[PDB]
């Protein structure tokens, strides 16, 4: 009736079943474990043995431990009762707010929709980020990828896309935290209590977001299936309630890394640079479910970590064919201080056709990319020689591109604690109007750093007029202010005497604490 553990090697458990093996992808429960240990059948090994991956740690598993087949795959709660909650990979609440109310429980494994129920509709998703909505504009209903190595700004950009797109739109949101830091998953949770996206207590039904978290400490079996769990919550909102969903996945790279960590223990000889042989089809089975169908619409935004800033690597390179907008973030843009560090040339969207976004958005975007590409072909000769042989046609396209480079920078409303600047939402029309000014020489007289970290072209003129006030405001405070004051710069021990001297205890006293922890519990 039930099976027993026959082999435990790392996160991969073999379970021997006397009679009627469970199906592949089905969920098994190990009873007698300290925590709830869910296994998922990866393959039939062939001697009435299945090979499984564990959704938790296998420390404490014993050969011979009873394993109960559940008869179905991993089933998670879906519905409005998950809005405002944090789920596990297996659907357990990890926010300590009680059990999750469930309209239905759904298998996290399903097939891709079909070819017949695909949606061929392109409408722009305006994000407020002017480098995005100019050069690589996002599609309302399409898959969006945020590429970039470690520390270029994938999580700040995906945080700014949350409060610029999900903070006011019609449907619901799902954040799938797949194998990233627990600290920033708590930062995202507490930011959405304060923003009112997640409401706690009796106002929980007015939430607009569900978190599904599978962060870095979880075993590779867990992180390989969180993206399927968060997608299942998004697939209920699309298939059953028929409405538009936003699905944010932080590092879809970690889904491919997690399958790669168990892959050799599942008996697979490795593929190229170290990934599993099923790398493209494991990834393709996931991304083909995140689609706009004829029932509703899932606007996916996936961060993709590129390892060692390498877009050639097979896990980022496979993701590129799955997306409708690939915002590529670069370290060289980040090292100059342009934030968001979007590579303006490498970012590609499918909404950048003239018959989709119009001609006055397409030609500005193709004009901005031409001036930035020409500058990179001159920067080979500027960094050697130094722009005194550059024709004053080439000198103007260096000054125009350097204004274009800073004008793609924008202060983010969520990066207000990194950059000391309140964030700017730029509308789509003000982005088109601004870059058409910088391209056609309408703003050639303004300084270069007047474009840096501003909203639109009206705030370049409110910053160039500000800096030309405040550089000639230097010499008021030179000849004075050293002495002769109203004595609110007072004497020495005047400022030392309001120092409330805190009592130092001059010994740690932990052995009195350690005995006190023995008497408690």
């Amino acid at each position: 009736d039930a099976g027993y553990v026959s082999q435990v090697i790392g996160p991969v458990v073999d379970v021997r079943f006397d009679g009627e093996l469970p199906s592949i992808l089905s969920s098994l429960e190990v009873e007698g474990h300290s925590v709830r240990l869910v296994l998922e059948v990866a393959q039939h090994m062939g001697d009435n043995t299945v090979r499984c991956i564990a959704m938790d740690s296998t420390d404490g598993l014993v050969r011979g431990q009873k394993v109960v087949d559940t008869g179905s795959p991993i089933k998670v709660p879906v519905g409005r009762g998950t809005l405002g909650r944090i789920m596990n990979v297996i659907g357990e609440p990890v926010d300590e707010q009680g059990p999750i109310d469930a309209a239905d429980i759904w298998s996290i494994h399903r097939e891709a929709p079909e070819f017949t129920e695909q949606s061929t509709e392109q409408e722009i998703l305006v994000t407020g980020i002017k480098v995005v909505d100019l050069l690589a504009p996002y599609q309302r209903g399409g898959k969006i990828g945020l590429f970039g190595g470690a520390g270029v700004g994938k999580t700040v950009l995906i945080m700014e896309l949350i409060n610029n797109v999900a903070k006011a739109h019609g449907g619901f949101s799902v954040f799938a935290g797949v194998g990233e830091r627990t600290r920033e998953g708590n930062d995202l949770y507490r930011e959405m209590i304060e923003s009112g996206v997640i409401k706690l207590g009796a106002e929980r039904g007015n939430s607009k977001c569900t978190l599904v978290y599978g962060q870095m400490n979880e075993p590779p079996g867990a992180r390989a299936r969180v993206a399927l769990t968060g997608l299942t919550v998004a697939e209920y909102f699309r298939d059953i309630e028929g409405q538009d969903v936003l699905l944010f996945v932080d590092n879809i790279f970690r889904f491919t890394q997690a399958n790669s960590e168990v892959s050799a223990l599942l008996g697979r000889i490795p593929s190229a640079v170290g990934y599993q042989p099923t790398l493209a089809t494991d990834l393709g089975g996931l991304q083909e479910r995140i689609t706009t169908t004829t029932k509703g619409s899932i606007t996916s935004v996936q961060a993709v970590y590129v390892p060692a800033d390498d877009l050639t690597d097979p896990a980022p390179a496979t993701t590129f064919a799955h997306l409708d907008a690939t915002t590529v973030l670069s370290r060289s843009i980040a090292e100059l201080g342009i934030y968001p560090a979007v590579d303006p040339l490498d970012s590609t969207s499918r909404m950048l056709n003239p018959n989709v976004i119009g001609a006055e958005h397409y030609n500005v975007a193709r004009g901005v990319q031409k001036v930035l590409q020409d500058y990179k072909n001159l920067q080979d000769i500027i960094a050697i020689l130094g722009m005194d042989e550059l024709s004053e046609e080439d000198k103007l396209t260096v000054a125009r591109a350097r204004k274009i480079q800073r004008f793609l920078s924008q202060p983010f409303q969520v990066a207000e604690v990194f950059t000391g600047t309140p964030g700017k939402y730029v509308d789509l029309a003000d982005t088109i109007s601004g870059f058409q000014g910088v391209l056609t020489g309408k703003y050639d007289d303004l300084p270069e750093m007047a474009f840096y970290m501003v909203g639109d072209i009206k705030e370049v003129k409110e910053k160039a007029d500000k800096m030309a006030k405040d550089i000639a405001s230097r010499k008021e405070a030179d000849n004075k202010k050293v002495s002769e004051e109203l004595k609110d710069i007072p004497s020495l021990d005047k400022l030392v005497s309001e120092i409330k001297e805190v009592v130092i205890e001059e010994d740690d006293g932990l052995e009195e604490d350690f005995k006190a922890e023995a008497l408690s519990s």
Partner: protein
């Protein structure tokens, strides 16, 4: 001045061709070595299963 810059920029295209030739020999050696290295990693992982 133009005729000594011409002899100076001839001596630096040679120096940037001699350096480019040593780098391409160094790149082909690294190109051959990483193909051997990735292949030994693949056969070792296969021999551990077979």
């Amino acid at each position: 001045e133009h005729a000594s810059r011409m002899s100076a920029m001839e001596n630096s295209t040679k120096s940037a061709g001699e350096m480019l030739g040593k780098l391409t020999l160094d790149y082909n050696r690294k190109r051959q070595a990483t193909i051997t290295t990735e292949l030994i990693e693949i056969i070792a992982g296969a021999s551990a299963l077979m």
